[PDB]
Amino acid sequence: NLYFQSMGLSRVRAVFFDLDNTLIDTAGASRRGMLEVIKLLQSKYHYKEEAEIICDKVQVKLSKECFHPYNTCITDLRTSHWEEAIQETKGGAANRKLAEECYFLWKSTRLQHMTLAEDVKAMLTELRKEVRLLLLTNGDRQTQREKIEACACQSYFDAVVVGGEQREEKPAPSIFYYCCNLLGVQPGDCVMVGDTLETDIQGGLNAGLKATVWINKNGIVPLKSSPVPHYMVSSVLELPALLQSIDCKV
Amino acid sequence: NLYFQSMGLSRVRAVFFDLDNTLIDTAGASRRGMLEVIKLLQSKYHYKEEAEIICDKVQVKLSKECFHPYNTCITDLRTSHWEEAIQETKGGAANRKLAEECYFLWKSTRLQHMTLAEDVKAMLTELRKEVRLLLLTNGDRQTQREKIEACACQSYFDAVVVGGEQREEKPAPSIFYYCCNLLGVQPGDCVMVGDTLETDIQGGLNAGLKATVWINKNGIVPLKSSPVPHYMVSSVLELPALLQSIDCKV
Ligand SMILES: [Cl-]
Ligand SMILES: [Cl-]
Ligand SMILES: [Cl-]
Ligand SMILES: [Cl-]
Ligand code: NA
Ligand code: NA
Incomplete structure (x- = not known):
């Protein structure tokens, strides 16, 4: 000194x-989030293994995420990740409400656990x-x-x-x-x-x-x-x- | 790892x-050694303040010490430091026995305290x-x-x-x-x-x-x-x- x-x-x-x-533990918390969405999709809507496919698809979309604040806010972009993943996997009409239900269960769970x-x-x-x-x-x-x-x-x-x-x-x-x-x-x-x-x-x-x-x-x-x-x-x-x-x- | x-x-x-x-604590121990030599020189032989002069003189000699093993061993060289310091200070005839008495009191004290x-x-x-x-x-x-x-x-x-x-x-x-x-x-x-x-x-x-x-x-x-x-x-x-x-x- x-x-x-x-x-x-x-x-x-x-x-x-x-x-x-x-x-x-962002990884751990986020994984908990996905686990709950799977639990939701299976027990409530009677999805089988394809519930995991949707979550994978969302992880992939998150990791290449491209956020333009001028154009959208983050909640919308991320809800779209889910919306696309769902349609990509289960086909049919875009289903925004189900997309939201997932995104928010994911978000709330992971925040609970941070x-x-x-x-x-x-x-x-x-x-x-x-x-x-x-x-x-x-x-x-x-x-x-x-x-x-x-x-x-x-x-x-x-x-x-x-x-x-x-x-x-x-x-x-x-x-x-x-x-x-x-x-x-x-x-x-x-x-x-x-x-x-x-x-x-x-x-x-x-x-x-x-x-x-x-x-x-x-x-x-x-x-x-x-x-x-x-x-x-x-x-x-x-x-x-x-x-x-x-x-x-x- | x-x-x-x-x-x-x-x-x-x-x-x-x-x-x-x-x-x-070599310094501390060695200082203890000198303190005992002073105590000795004063109480036993009735030296006054010049007892400190002798010790100073020995510290100086130690610090410029020049040891040739071919020529002497360390005990002799160091006993001579004391012998010289004594004569330098109190004059008279070289007094080896008193030199030894000091050197050994110094040596034993400092070793006791290491x-x-x-x-x-x-x-x-x-x-x-x-x-x-x-x-x-x-x-x-x-x-x-x-x-x-x-x-x-x-x-x-x-x-x-x-x-x-x-x-x-x-x-x-x-x-x-x-x-x-x-x-x-x-x-x-x-x-x-x-x-x-x-x-x-x-x-x-x-x-x-x-x-x-x-x-x-x-x-x-x-x-x-x-x-x-x-x-x-x-x-x-x-x-x-x-x-x-x-x-x-x-
Ligand atoms: Cl990271
Ligand atoms: Cl894509
Ligand atoms: Cl040192
Ligand atoms: Cl000298
Ligand atoms: Na980090
Ligand atoms: Na040292």
Whole structure:
């Protein structure tokens, strides 16, 4: 500390966290959503295995989703995913009401199941005593804000930034610099923590953050040409210990 | 771990520790030694303040000490330091017996007071479950081995290496490579921990060790042109936590 100052060398001042599958189980929650739609489609409307086909089709449509706010809102686009999947699978006339019934069961279920764990809450409270905390999350305004509210997590952060609201999102560095200015700190004083190499980690690298930490809960190996983070941990609960160590590097 | 292997990237395999004022309080113990010599010289022989002058003179002689094993052994050289300091201060005939009486009171006191703390013992036991441990200490054979025995610490290590026994000492890299071979590991797999930038840390740097950790208990600032370590901590008790973090760097 005395030494570090002498060297022109900063303690960490802010930590940016990812949201989806870093602090909340979006995959798990979303899967729960699909499970309920299947349960609905089968028990209520007497669909057999083709109920799974519809859900698959929706996952596929979600993953190539192309959202134009000028043209539609997100609820309509997503309800259409379901509407198409249903017709694609069961044929007949477009059935919007059934589409809505699915979309909303899916949405409500997954939001019900997006939660900060008690131990994650406990941590985020500790860290904030010592550093600033900012949530930096990709995605459209409505969907992400709904998520932030569903897991009641905004109170844990000094700021919250949603990519769909900004001119570029992760891994464009502009969004990181925007974050730094919100907090009044420098990129060199900041650590990005998140679960996706091509957004969270690469973004961190693009913006020259002090450090990038990759959460790899399942110990997967990534592809050869992919961005290399500064550290890798299995759990966000390890961050406090790691940050202490980071503050010792010279 | 799965990822790190994929990258060709090693967990730490061995940690080398410094001895003097890293695991035992050599300065404190040695000061205790001088205090007893003063107590002796004053109460027994009725010396006044000049007892402190003698001890100062010995510290000075120790710090510029020039040991030729071909010519003398260490006990004789050091007894001469005292003998000279006494004559320099109180004049008269060289008095070897008084010189010996001092040297041995000093030596016995400081050895009495070189001890591993219970918490340091507890740590070294934990680390060894997970990594190899080697003591790498500068100084003449007899003096250092006497110290190693005095604090009963050899049982905590897989190997113990004394610079005075080797062809070069810290920070010559030859001694580090020698250490690696003793343990059957690579320099890239090893971390040096110690309290002196110009021996422990520089040596680590010269030998390409994975990492060098500087213990700076008192938070002193070093001189501009001095070697920069990889980390700095206030206590060896922090090493376990730090090593975990080191094993996450990519
Ligand atoms: Cl993700
Ligand atoms: Cl399509
Ligand atoms: Cl020293
Ligand atoms: Cl002299
Ligand atoms: Na994510
Ligand atoms: Na030392």
